[PDB]
């Protein structure tokens, strides 16, 4: 729900940002239309075309105000002020970004070290694309297919899954894709018994 | 001490319009009591001169339409400086004045008449008065940039990264 | 085509398979490159859909970070859509990529709008979209059709605006 | 008029890019991250170009004097005229820099020159640091 709230907030914020920006184009489109009608026709919105025949903006001349010490020095020192501001928020935003990056990054080094020091080794290991997920996952070939077995029903392929809850490693076979639970070990544990 | 810019400054005089009403005849009379009317302008000097004497495209159209405007030239040609003159009028609600200053350069070698130079823009809309587009554009752009910054920082907060997938939401 | 001698085969008025007259269509390097890239990616998508019928990743191709990455994506596209039997197509695509004035679709649309707002000939418009000229006279000499047809101020404005529109690499 | 014409075309393309990013954000499903980055960078650099070009031609914009058309009727379109006429900032930005100045708060001049010398010293120091190690 917070994601929906923030998405709506950013939508309305960008709409507010663009509403004021539209009026700049609405004003500035008038000059060319006054100078050249045909080029200017398409620039304005249909409502503004209906409002008036466009010849609105015409060139005019006004002199530049006489300069003095009064306003430039204050203008530039206050620009110094806003850019010192921008530097402050620059440092703050960079600090926040680096703190977030450091925390997350050390988290994936924690998982990374768990993976590195949890995996042992000869074994036929490769990457495969999951039928359901479509991503790349590690798989191990453990069947007797290359040892001389003619059993074609099963390929002896087990996918490696890092257990999120226990931070351990588990093997999921290809054939038994129906049992989805933690009781896989006992549900699949079969045996051969000889009675005399 | 915080001052509201005179460009956005808007004066309302309900008593004057109630007493006299809005007309081209007294539009300058309506403007007289406003803060925008400088007391150092030669128009006020002409006003006291008249008072003492009594006690003792569309530019050419409005030129030929009114005789008091004539009297305005024949009383204003003698005095050079900051003066208030009408720009255009469309009845019964729209009037705009022309804010220009005059320097009657009568020096030898200049065949042109007195120099007329603009100073300000004033628009009389209804009973209200209005007085740079560059500032408008930069203000709109900067507010748009602020909103964009807020949206982008929120979106980057929403962003989450994993090494094995990339960035997702 | 100094004197706009396009011949019968390339007349301004074209008769399509529907029998209606159409304006002759001319595309510069950017427009032609974008059109051919769009056609190739659409054909690749159709091929993938057909293969899935008999039996995400495409967003990265159109959006290229750099020229070299764009060229690598182009090579992959040619390998997966053309078969490598057409060297002339590869040479033309490389020439388009290396000397494409504009990479983004919106900027190309801006250039098209700027050039064809005046209503010039499609040949002249495509030539201006292909050639970047510093001065109006340079374009007028290098494009003899533009002589006597466009004012020098307009040509200078168009050339300066186009030079400003060029996306920095 | 040429300067305002260039401002017009560039601002029109900027508004077109804004409309673009708008109608690809309005979808109920968010596209890939990379497309969003490309759109952001393109539109934002375009805004930079807008700012630079508006900077370049301040004199032409200032010289122009605004005046309503004789044919334009104000009696019926006074609301539309007032809409474009108004220029006061949105309030939130106003108190935003008011709090910013509140937080920021011959002495000022000598701090200014001290900032000058710190800037120059830091620039020279990083030039030296870059020159210390061969980066080619």
């Amino acid at each position: 729900e917070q994601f929906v709230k923030r998405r709506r907030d950013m939508l309305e914020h960008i709409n507010l940002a663009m509403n004021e920006s539209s009026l700049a184009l609405e004003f500035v489109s008038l000059l060319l239309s006054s100078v050249k009608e045909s080029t200017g026709m398409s620039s304005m919105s249909p409502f503004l075309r209906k409002v008036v025949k466009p010849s609105s903006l015409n060139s005019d001349k006004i002199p530049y105000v006489a300069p003095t010490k009064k306003e430039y020095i204050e203008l530039d020192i206050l620009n110094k002020g806003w850019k010192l501001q921008s530097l402050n928020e620059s440092k703050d935003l960079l600090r926040a970004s680096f703190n977030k990056l450091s925390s997350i990054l050390q988290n994936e080094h924690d998982y990374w070290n768990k993976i590195m020091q949890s995996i042992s080794n000869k074994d036929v290991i490769f990457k495969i694309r999951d039928r359901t997920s479509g991503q790349k996952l590690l798989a191990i070939k453990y069947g007797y297919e290359d040892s001389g077995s003619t059993y074609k029903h099963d390929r002896g392929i087990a996918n490696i899954r890092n257990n999120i809850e226990s931070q351990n490693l588990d093997l999921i076979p290809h054939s038994s894709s129906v049992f989805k639970g933690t009781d896989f070990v006992h549900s699949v544990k079969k045996f051969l018994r000889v009675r005399i | 001490m915080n001052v509201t810019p005179l460009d956005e400054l808007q004066w309302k005089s309900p008593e004057w319009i109630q007493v006299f009403g809005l007309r081209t005849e007294n539009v300058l009379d309506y403007f007289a009591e406003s803060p925008f009317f400088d007391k150092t302008s030669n128009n006020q000097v002409i006003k006291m001169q008249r008072q003492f004497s009594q006690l003792n495209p569309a530019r050419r159209q409005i030129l030929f339409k009114y005789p008091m405007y004539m009297q305005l030239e024949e009383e204003l040609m003698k005095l050079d400086g900051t003066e208030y003159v009408l720009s255009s009028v469309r009845e019964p609600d729209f009037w705009v004045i022309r804010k220009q200053r005059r320097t009657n350069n009568s020096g030898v070698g200049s065949a042109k008449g007195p120099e007329i130079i603009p100073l300000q823009d004033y628009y009389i809309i209804g009973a209200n008065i209005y007085q740079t587009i560059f500032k408008i554009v930069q203000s709109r752009l900067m507010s748009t940039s602020y909103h964009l910054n807020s949206t982008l920082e929120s979106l980057y907060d929403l962003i989450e990264f994993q090494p094995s997938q990339g960035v997702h939401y | 085509a100094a004197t706009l001698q396009l011949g019968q085969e390339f007349q301004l008025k074209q008769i399509n398979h529907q029998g209606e007259e159409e304006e002759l269509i001319a595309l510069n390097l950017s427009e032609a490159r974008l059109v051919i890239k769009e056609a190739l990616v659409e054909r690749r998508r159709a091929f993938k859909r057909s293969q899935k019928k008999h039996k995400a990743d495409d967003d990265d191709f159109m959006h290229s970070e750099t020229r070299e990455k764009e060229l690598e994506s182009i090579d992959v596209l040619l390998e997966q859509t053309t078969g490598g039997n057409n060297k002339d197509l590869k040479n033309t695509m490389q020439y388009l990529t290396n000397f494409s004035r504009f990479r983004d679709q919106e900027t190309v649309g801006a250039v098209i709008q700027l050039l064809k707002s005046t209503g010039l000939h499609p040949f002249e418009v495509a030539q201006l979209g292909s050639l970047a000229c510093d001065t109006a006279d340079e374009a007028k000499t290098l494009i003899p059709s533009l002589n006597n047809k466009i004012s020098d101020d307009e040509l200078e404005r168009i050339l300066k605006e186009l030079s400003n529109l060029e996306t920095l690499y | 008029g040429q300067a305002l014409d260039a401002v017009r075309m560039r601002l029109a393309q900027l508004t077109h890019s804004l409309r673009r990013i708008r109608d690809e954000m309005s979808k109920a499903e968010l596209p890939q991250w990379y497309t969003l980055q490309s759109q952001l960078n393109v539109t934002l650099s375009q805004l930079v170009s807008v700012t630079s070009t508006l900077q370049h031609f301040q004199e032409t914009l200032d010289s122009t004097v605004v005046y309503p058309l004789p044919k334009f009727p104000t009696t019926s379109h006074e609301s539309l005229v007032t809409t474009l006429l108004r220029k006061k900032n949105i309030p939130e930005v106003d108190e935003w820099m008011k709090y910013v100045r509140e937080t920021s708060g011959e002495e000022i001049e000598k701090l200014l020159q001290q900032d000058r010398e710190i800037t120059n010293w830091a620039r020279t120091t990083f030039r030296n640091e870059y020159g210390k190690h061969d980066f080619k």
Partner: peptide, 25 residues
């Protein structure tokens, strides 16, 4: 020509922020 015109993005609902103060005589 022109690939596409701009959609009308008028905001009459915007309340505006005109400062009013010199009304008293």
């Amino acid at each position: 020509p022109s690939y596409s015109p701009t959609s009308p993005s008028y905001s009459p609902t915007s309340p505006s922020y005109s400062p009013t103060s010199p009304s008293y005589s």
